[PDB]
Structures are given as C-alpha cells and as structure tokens.
Amino acid sequence: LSKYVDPSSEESHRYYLARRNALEMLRDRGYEVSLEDINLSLQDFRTVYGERPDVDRLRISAHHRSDSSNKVKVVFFGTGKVKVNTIRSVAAEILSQETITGLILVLQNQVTDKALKAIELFTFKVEIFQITDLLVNLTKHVLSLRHRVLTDGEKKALLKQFNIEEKQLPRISKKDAVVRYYGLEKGQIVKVSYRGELTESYVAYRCVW
Amino acid sequence: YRSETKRNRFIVRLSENQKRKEKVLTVYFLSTEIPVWVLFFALGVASDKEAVDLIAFDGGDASITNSVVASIQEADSVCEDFRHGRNALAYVEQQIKGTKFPPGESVDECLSLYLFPGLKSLTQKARFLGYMVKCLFSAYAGKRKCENRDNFRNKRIELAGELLERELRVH
Amino acid sequence: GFSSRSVITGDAFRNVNEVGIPMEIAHRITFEERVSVHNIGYLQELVDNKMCLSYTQGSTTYSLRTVLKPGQIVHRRVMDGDVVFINRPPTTHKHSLQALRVYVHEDNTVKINPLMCGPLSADFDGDCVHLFYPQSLTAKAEVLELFSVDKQLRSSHTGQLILQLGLDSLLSLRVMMEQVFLDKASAQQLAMYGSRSLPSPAVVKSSKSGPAWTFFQILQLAFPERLSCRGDGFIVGGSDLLSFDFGVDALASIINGIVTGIMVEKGPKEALAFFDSLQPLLMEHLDPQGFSLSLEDLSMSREDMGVIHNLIVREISPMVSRLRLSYEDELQLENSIQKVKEVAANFMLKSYSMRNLIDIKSNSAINKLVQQIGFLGLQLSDKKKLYTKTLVEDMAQFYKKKYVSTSSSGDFGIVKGCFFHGLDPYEEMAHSVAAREVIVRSSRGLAEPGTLFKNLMAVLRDIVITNDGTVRNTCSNSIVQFKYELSSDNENQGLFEAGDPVGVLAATAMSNPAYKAVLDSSPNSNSSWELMKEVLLCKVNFQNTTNDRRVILYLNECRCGKKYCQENSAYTVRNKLKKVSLKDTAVEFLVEYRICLHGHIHLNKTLLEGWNISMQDILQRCEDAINSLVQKKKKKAEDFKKMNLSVSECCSFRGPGSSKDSDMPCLMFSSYNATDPDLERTLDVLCNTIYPVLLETVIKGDPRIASANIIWNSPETTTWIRSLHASRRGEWVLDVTVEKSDVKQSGDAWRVVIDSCLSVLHLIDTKRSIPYSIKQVQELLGLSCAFEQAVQRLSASVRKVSKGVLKEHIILVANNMTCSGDMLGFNYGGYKALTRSLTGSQFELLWN
Amino acid sequence: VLFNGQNAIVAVNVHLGFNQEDSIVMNKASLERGMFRSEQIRSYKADVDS
Amino acid sequence: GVVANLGRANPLQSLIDLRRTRQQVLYTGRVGDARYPHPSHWGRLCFLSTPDGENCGLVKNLSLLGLVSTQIMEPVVEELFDSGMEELMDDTSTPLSGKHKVLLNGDWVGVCSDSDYFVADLKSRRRQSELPRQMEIKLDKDDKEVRIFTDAGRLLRPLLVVENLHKLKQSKPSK
DNA sequence: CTCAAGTATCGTAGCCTGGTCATTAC
DNA sequence: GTAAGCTAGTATTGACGATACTTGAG
RNA sequence: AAAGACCAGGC
Ligand SMILES: [Mg+2]
Ligand SMILES: [Zn+2]
C-alpha cells in the first residue's frame, strides 16, 4: 500500500462513497436504516453492483425511527446535462409509487434555475445535492461540532428569559453545511458548545433564518 | 525610434493583427500601419535575399524565419505585386495620404524629411531599418535585454538652459 | 472649555497623577465657579489678591483685568490642585485620555512623570501634548470619575497594569540586586525617601565590618501598613518582604505581582502610593554610583570574531547559493543565521554593562546588538520586497564587477561586516537598499491600518453591554452575545460592567498591533500583518484568487510499521496528481511529404524514462482528449474529421539541424478530410490549428491540478491548521493548487481535489485535510467551524506582534463578523451586504 | 560654514532620571559663559501705494 | 516640481538646495524601483542622503566630484576617420559581417573592422587634447557596436588614468 | 435570449496637523 | 470666452478594484 | 472669503 494505486474503476467508487454518505446522513438524521448497508467494503460493493453501475437500481431508502408515516427515497442521476422534464416525469412516477414524505435528489453536474421552482410545487419536501459534495463526510471531520436542535418548548423557554422575538438572535443561513446536512427548516434554533483553548466553556445559540 | 519632431516617431512592432496567427512585423510611421516588407521595397531594395541580408539573422532561430516568411506572405496579401516598379511607393502614397491631418508633401520629400534625419541615402535608411529589426529579433530570443528606465545610462538631466529654451518657445 | 499645546519633558520626583504647567499658560486660562455659600470668604480672598480674571453677574460680562454676593460666575486662574485632562494628538493614540492634577512652574514645558510615557506612548524628543480644561461641573465629575489614573490602573486591552517599571528604575533594581548589602549611611539616606520606617538591620554585627541591611528591607519601605499577600516568586507578610527569589529573567514579573497584590488588597490609591515612594528611592540609589558603557563593551575579541567569520564562510554562504534559487517556502536561511546570531549573543553578553541595558529575552532588541558587534546578515532578497528582481540581478552583476579581487568569495546579499568596524562601499549600498525599503514600507504603508480602523469603527460602534447583561447592538437591538465574560453575573462584579462600549474597545485592541507591526516593518511583523489581513478582510463575493484554490492534504500513518514508507505514499499521490504535458517533452515539429503532408512531433527520450512514460500512453492520452474536444463544444472544431494518429519509438526523419540520429520518439499525425488542391492551406491547418491543440495535451497526472508540491510542515507551530489530533509534530503535507480554469463558484477546489484523488484516496487522511482560506472552510465545514478557525488564526497573528491581548475582544470580533448568517469582512463588500440584510438612555435620576 | 554647532564635552551617564526617553542635561555655568548662545532677527514688512 | 525656494538658514542648506535632481512621477505612491539606489548611481549620486516623506528616493543629491556635461558645438564626425573608421557605402547589396557599427548620438555613421584599436586610439587622442573632453566612447562586445555620445545632460566624474600615472615623478610637486 | 466574460472604462488610491506663498487679465 | 494656436491625429512611470457592455445557447 | 502650491513635524 505504501506505493499501491488501485487499478480499478473510479466511478463505481464514487457512487459507493456517495451512497454510503447518503445512508450516513439519513442514519445521523435519525431515520431507521439497515446497519451494514452503511458498513460494507468497496470490494463487495464491486461484486454486487459492478464496475460501471446503473443508477436506477439504487437504494430506495426507509422510513422514520419512532414515527411510521414519515418515509423517504433517494434518486440518482446520469452524467450529462439535465432538463427538468425528466424530473417532472420521475416525480410523477414517485408520487404514483406508494407514498413518501420526501426524497433526496443527488444530481450530477448541474441544476437548473428552471428546476427549483418546478420542483417547489410538489406535494412533499425534497432536497437537491451534488455528487461531488458527497464524498467526504463533513460530520466525521475533526473540526466538526455538535448541533443539537432544541425542542419547540425549549425554544419557548429560552425566549422566556431574554424577552426577545427571534429576529434579534444571531442567525445561521439555510444554505449552510450543517443546516442541509440535518435538513433544518427556517425558525428552528440550534446550540453549539465550543471546544478549543480560547473558546472552551462557551456556548452559542443560532436561529435558522 | 524618437527624435525632436513629433513627425519623426518610428515604431516596429512584432505582434498578431488578427486561427493562431504567426507573429508579424508592423511599422507605425506617420500614424499609419504599414508592413515592413512594403517599406523595404519602397526604400529601394531589390530582392528578399538581400532584405534578409540587411536584417542579418545570424542563422538558425526558426521563429525568426517563421516571422519573416509570414511577413512576406502577408505583404503579398495586401498589395498585388508590390515588388514591381513604384507599386509599393504608390501604396505608401495612398496609405500616408488617407490619414487624419496628412502632411503637406509627396512621399519622396516625406521620406527625405521625416524618415531618419541625419542619414543621407535611402540605402542607408534601409540598412538602418534592417538594424532595427535585428535588434528586435535579438531581444525576442533572449540575447538582448529590455531597457529599464532606472539604469541611469538611459537618462539625461535638464538644467536651466534646457528648461528656459522650452519655456521661451511657448511664449 | 480651553485647550493648550506644549512640549513635554519629564520629572521623576513629583507624583504619578501630577502634571506641571507653565506659568504663561496658567495665568491666561480660567476656571469658572458659581459663587454661593461655603465659598464666600475663600473666593473673596482670591478676588482681593487679584487672582480672579473675570466676572459675570447675570449676563453682562463686566471685566476685572466688586464684592461677592451669592449667585454669579467668577472666572479665576489655574492654580494648584485643579484637574485637566491630557491627550497626545490621537493619530494612533486611541485610548490615551488621562486625568491629571495641576501644579504650576516657571519654565516653558509640560512636566509629567516618566511612568506615564507608556500609557501615552510618548517620549521626550520633541513631542507635544494637548491639555484640555473642563469648565462644567458635571464634566469635572465625569473626568474625575472615569479617567483618573487609579481608576484606569488595570488595562482594558490586556489584563495587565498600565504602569510598569521602565528604563532607569529597572536598571537601579538590577544593580541593587547584584550587590545585596548596604552600609548604614546610604541605607538611612534611602530611608529618608520611604513612607514606612527603616527596620532593624538584617546583619547586626560581623567581626569584619559594621551592620548591614539587605535590599529587600529597602524595597519594603514603600509598602502600606499590614500588607500580607502572595504570588509566584514572593511572599509578603506583615508588611515585610519575607521572600523574593533570585533572577533577572523574573524580576519585572515579580514586581508586577507585588503591585497586583497591593491593588487586590490594600486601598483606594495604595498602588500609586507604592510607585510614588519607590521611584525616587531608586533614582537616589543609582545616583552615587553612575552607569556607563565604553568601547570595551562593543569590541568582540579576535577569537570570537574569527569563529563568527568561520561559521559564516563554512555554513551560511554555500547554503544561500542553493536555497535562495528555490522559492519562498525555504526560510531555513533564517533559522541557520539565527543560530549563528545566538552564538554571537552568547559571546557579547560577557560584558557587564551590555546585559543590564537591554531585555535579554527580547529578540527584536537582541538582533540590533548583533548587527553592531557582529555581522549584519542578509540584506538583499527577491521575496515579498517592495523592489523588483531586476534590481537584485543588477546588484549581483555589480558584485561581480567591483570585487575584482577574488569575486564570489561569499554571496552578494550577505553582509559580513559590522557597524562598529565599518562597512565597505558595496556593503553600504546593499544595506542602504534594505534601509530604504523599510523606510518606504513604514511611511507609505500606513493606509491599510487607516482603512481598517475606519471600517472597524463603522460596524463596531454601537455594541454595548446592556442592563440585563446581554451584549447587544443598539441601532437594531439584536443580540450579538449572551455574555461578555464567562464568569460575569449579578453576584460577582468583573472588569467590565453594564454600559461599557465593548465594540470600541475591540476595534482599538485590533488596530493597535496593526499599527505597531507596520511601524516596525520587520519580516516577522510583516508576516503577522499579512495573517491578520487574511482574516479581517475576507470578501463575501467570490474573487477566485490564488489562496482560494489552495488545499492542504494530510496523510495516514505507518505502512506495516516499516521505516520510510510515509514519504512513499506522499509521492505516490504526488505522481498521481502532478501535471506534465506534451510540450514539456516536445522539441521540434517537422512536416514531411511522402495523403501527402505528415507531421512529426519529436520528443525527448530521457524525460519519458525519468517520469516512466511510454508512447502508447501518449497515444491514448491524446486520442481521448481530442475525441472529447471534437465532442464537447461542436463548432469550428471540424478539423478532426478523419485526422490520423500514429506512434513509433524511432522515426529518424531528421530535418536539417540538431540530429539525435536514432530513437528520437515521434508522434506522427496526418489529415484526410482536407482534400485540398493546394499544399499551402494544408500547411496552415496542420501548423496553426492541430499543432496548437496537440501541445497542451497532458499525458501524466490530472488535467485540472495546476501544482501539487510537498511541504514537511513541522513549523514548531504543531499542526498550524489542526486543533486536536495527537502530540505528533512532524507530518508531511501536500499543498495542492488548482488551475484557474476549473474553479467557477466558491468551494470548487476541494471538489476537484477529492475527485481527482479518488483512485488513491485510501491513503489520504480524509478526516483532517482542509482548504487554506477561511471562506472555503466556511463552504466546506460550515459557519461555526469558520468562527472557531477565525478566532484561532486571529489569536496567533495578534500574539506574534503584541503579547497578551484578551480573548474577549477577539471573540466579540468573530461574533460580530458571523452574526448576519455568513462570515463577512471589514470592507465595503461586507458592509453593504449586512447594511442591506438589516450610559445614555440606560438610567435616569430623579428626586425621592 | 559646513559645520554649525559647538564642541560640547559629553558624558554618558544617568542623571537622577532626568535624561530618560532621549532627554539631555546641560550645564548652567557653561551656558552662562556663552555656549549655544544665539541671536535672532525677525523682519516685519508692509507696503502702500504711492 | 521644477522651481524651488532658496533656503538661507545656514550656508549648507543653500549649498544643498542647489545640487538636487528629480524624477517626477504621476501618482506618487505607486512607482517601481524609482525610490531605490541603483548600482549606476556610483560616484555620481549619493546613495545615503534622500528625503523621507513622499519624495523619498525621487529626489537625489549630486556627489561631490560630479559634473553635468554640456553640448559640444564643433563637428566631431570628420575626425573619426583618422583612427580607422570607414564610410557607409550606398549599394544595399554588399554585406558587412565582422565589422562593428559606430553610432554618433544614435545615428549610424560608419563601420570599423578592428574595434580594440579604434577605441584605444580615440581614447589616446582624447588624453592629448585634440578630441573634446566630454566625449563618451563605449565599446560593446556582445552587440558588436561602438557608441559615441557628445550631447548634453550626461553625468561625469574624474578618475586617475593608471598608465599615465608615472608622469608625476619626473614633474615638480607644485600644487 | 440571458449569464459570463473579455474587455471598457472609472477612480481612488495615505492622512492629519501646522507654518508659508501667491492667486488672468481679458 | 477665453478651452486653454489646431493638436493631436495612440505612438513615454501606476496600478487595482468597481461598474458596465457584446458575444453562445440551453 | 474659498481652493491650489510648498515646506516641516508626527502617525
Ligand atoms: Mg517622539
Ligand atoms: Zn518524426
């Protein structure tokens, strides 16, 4: 290994890392997904799906841990430049399937400004990602910190103390890394406790805005 | 080349006036872009071999040969057989005369007045143009350095006579 | 009311909070008083002695230059005991407003205590101050209550004291420490200056001499009564200095501990009384001894100078002709010349006068003495200097020209001589270039601190600690922070209180080290100001500069636990990444006639083998790229219709010049769609379209990585961009830089380094590698990670220039930057962004 | 006339803390005997029409 | 920045106000190496004394033995033939390889075959007062060129000539 | 039928206090 | 009325950010 | 009056 290079296909390895990243983000978000559907090798991935894998034979993912009616899917894509008629037809068959509460669209090379408004009208809440953003797990990095979201009652009890109206708080934008990694809506309030030799024993509270 | 008169400025440029053209030679004389091969045959040279003798390439250097054959076959793409008698001279007549504020002169008196003052014959002006092009090609290949204006061998110092002359000419 | 400008001089024998005012100033400035009960007789005495200048009863200003009834305004002249406030004209003097008590003299200057030079950052070489004179009574109360010296004793930028024992006082303490005992006459003469009583002698009787005190009993003569405190190197008990440990490396810190003991438990003014009794005692101790320096102090021996010159001509000069030809990352020069400078300092601190007149642990002040006694060191280089490289080449050629006596006997950028023995004319010119560059950088370069302070005050002006304790903006009434300190609450008071303008304090604590760094303009203080600007001046719009494309890649640890296997993985990934193209191997392009015209790209045989490339590789890596470029962006690229390629190890066509005769490797190409009736247009298409696009084809490595070099890191900064991994210190890293043509929007360089690292990615430490710029960390890891990294970088840069800045101002700066939602800068691009996105009135008195 | 000043005898020594921060201490009797004694002439000008 | 006031605080301020030189620039604050000493200042401009404000390095001071040349009014081109210079013929057909070009104030006036005899004979005729004293002769081996300057504005300085230096012994040491 | 972009320009680039002068008549 | 004879007519030390235009192509 | 232009001292 000290000087080894893997003489295999890279695109199967890219779909492997991106699919385990999707599974990881669902498991750390909280939904029940199968163990070791995360924890599997690259080699047995290459045995089960090949070296040049097809995308519609993906992992149709599972539902909520404690709730039952909250279920979700993933949709992978092809390489070339995309047009939104594909997304509307696949959304028609998605809503025809059984029932969901959303899905993750992992795109490949481009999203369209015609696309985001033409997926905005659908009857659930879906996400759009990028295939090259999903390689390294950002919550496995050393510099990452915990973002424990507090309940609506704890939000009320914090707004009790300082007599404030939620737009005088410090903010965190919704097009942020950890905000889309946990799939947070506007108006939730998250806290973070800092470790680090100038900011130890220091906590912060931000409102998604 | 600069001088006293503002009508004496003479520039030879090595550039692309445009795929992927070879770099060619251009003359900016009397606010008029002229190919340098036309000016060579206008000053009185007879052959391309003696024109590249006037430049004196010192051999080799295929970029120099590429630039001179591109400038030849670009000279031939502007005037139809400029090498025949007074064709290039008529070309620089109609190229000088069409400018903004043309000079009150024919081209022969224009050459004897505003082209390289201090030289006698047009033969010597062709030789000086070949020396100028040799200097440019030698700087191109990295054998010559560009002038920097911080080296004081490129500077003159003006005191009371030089300033008082300039002030007195205005009034 | 009134103002006054005057030249300052010093006076060590009056009190710290006293200012001496010239009589010409004092007899023309007035103070106004409202005459009423408890001051009829006292003001009547003054008007009888013609010390009141003017008067007004009602409104009609009748002059006196009249008896007193209660209710009019007397304007008397300045006398002893009044309060003025002092300010040097605040060019950088942002917090120097001090309140002082007035005495009058006959000279022309303004006299202040020498302990007040560092709170004002003034010296006695021509400086002038402005004195202001408060007229209203509520203004007198505000000046006396906020800006007095005992009120302002503990600093608000750092946690330290604004009053430190300096030049002559510390030297007096050092010479009082190297001899320990004092006889009776000088001890009683010193005891005349103490506020306490002289103790019994520590030594009552020896058989040799008489009684003798120690200097601890002299130093204790300034304490207050019944003091008992404790610190690091001292024990004080019962107002007696019981213990004080040895040192000269500790002495100033022990004095600072004694003063903070007194000002933690002693009074309302007792630390000032301590200084007011200590300083004249130390002057009167040093005065019957004197202190000087001779030529012997400045003359290094012949042996030590021979060792210095031998270490230079052995180590420094053969290296400097190697690693200066490389690029900027090799500052090994500075470490090695610092080792030789350490040797020189160890030599020169054998003279007793020189070690008492400097701070030994300081390094900016110890390089200046090495330049005088020994060599000057490096004076010319072509890295981040304000002059160009043509000047450096001209100076190297001039070095060849002038030392015609055995040229290249050393380097041209190293000066070997000293100031004490004199420079050559060449060494003088080389030193004069470096001095001129420092002077220009210090004078012209004072506009970026000037801009930074304006944009810092424009955003940080209205951030106040409120009455409930939350640090809030006041124009928008939004929470910037929930607590300013970490132990402040309504049971425990602290250094900061409600109503404090903490934003202005943060802005000034940020602007001070910037101005200090530029006014010094050392290489270290230049690099620190660079590191500070790279945090404080970020841009919310993507500018895709050089730092935006840089990525640091880390590695794993211990292949099979064998020695020398981590560098092998480093070059494995380097050999996978690094870009070398076909034109890096091409030498000539030879068009042949045998359809008819056939091009021969000729190669070099050796660099194919030194990089392990074969020719079928080059055929593949040309063919895939040319078929992609005829597939991508299909217009004006129909020259590759049926163009042909071919490969051979040997062709030997060998056109007229520079033959290799055999195995000159050749990539033949041709065309077949150009069925032309002329050769002259075929030569145009094969020499002006195809041959350009066939040169920039890359053969080994990835086409998007512009560079990927290996740095050993290990800068004894211990993982400068890591926070908690291990106690390891010697990792080797790759600093990948992507080409400009690939990064389009922000965050792309990480995306194209990870995707191009994909077949070798089992070797890279995925959980540790990060980008280089702080906005790219914000794009990759999020806003909280960017906040913590901005604190961690700003702290290092500010600690390199000026030591001990409090963490509260840095945390407030990083909170105010990232309060809008995304990290913004202190420039116009950040200011208009937030502007688009978006004490007084604190209490009220009334009767009861 | 290339040199404008005096030859003063200088000692390098501390003087009760009165020469700190680049101050100097001078001699009273050397000043009374005429060292560094200076004359100064100022001109005040005015014009009218004739 | 052309005409200044004369200062009379002491005679030295008046002396150094008359010996200054200036490089005027457009926006003061973004120049190249104009503010720095160049090695071609040696002996003619002081590299130690300069202002420190905005005019740092842009205003120079003359050295002590520095002289500014003036224009030579006599014709000099016809006395160049006596040292081994030949004419520039008019045929544009003859090649001139090996010969060095001579340039008088930038104007090409002739060629010379041996250049290490032409220059050494011109310099010997200048040291005997039949050529003007302010005439600059530069031999250029790489460009194959001999440049001669006789115009105004050049900075000169005196130097000892070593090979003529033995002519003091036989003279008399009167001042 | 619009983003980006490749130019095409605009405009500020050290800043503040002192003292001074010399200020087109037509 | 001065426009700064007509004056050049690009034909000589600045150099970046910041805003505004004429391409191809989904 | 107001601006230009210069010089000096700091930052
Ligand atoms: Mg000072
Ligand atoms: Zn070949």
Side-chain angles (χ1 to χ4, degrees), chain C residues 763-783:
Chain C
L763 302 176
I764 179 186
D765 204 327
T766 289
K767 302 177 309 302
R768 287 188 61 197
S769 47
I770 45 158
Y772 174 69
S773 181
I774 182 61
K775 298 281 289 195
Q776 311 306 122
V777 191
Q778 186 209 342
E779 193 78 19
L780 176 63
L781 297 172
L783 180 79

Side-chain angles (χ1 to χ4, degrees), chain C residues 440-452:
Chain C
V440 167
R441 185 184 287 276
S442 308
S443 66
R444 317 300 281 171
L446 278 185
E448 320 161 284
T451 294
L452 182 63

Side-chain angles (χ1 to χ4, degrees), chain C residues 88 122-127:
Chain C
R88 202 161 181 260
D123 55 344
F124 311 137
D125 66 338
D127 297 15

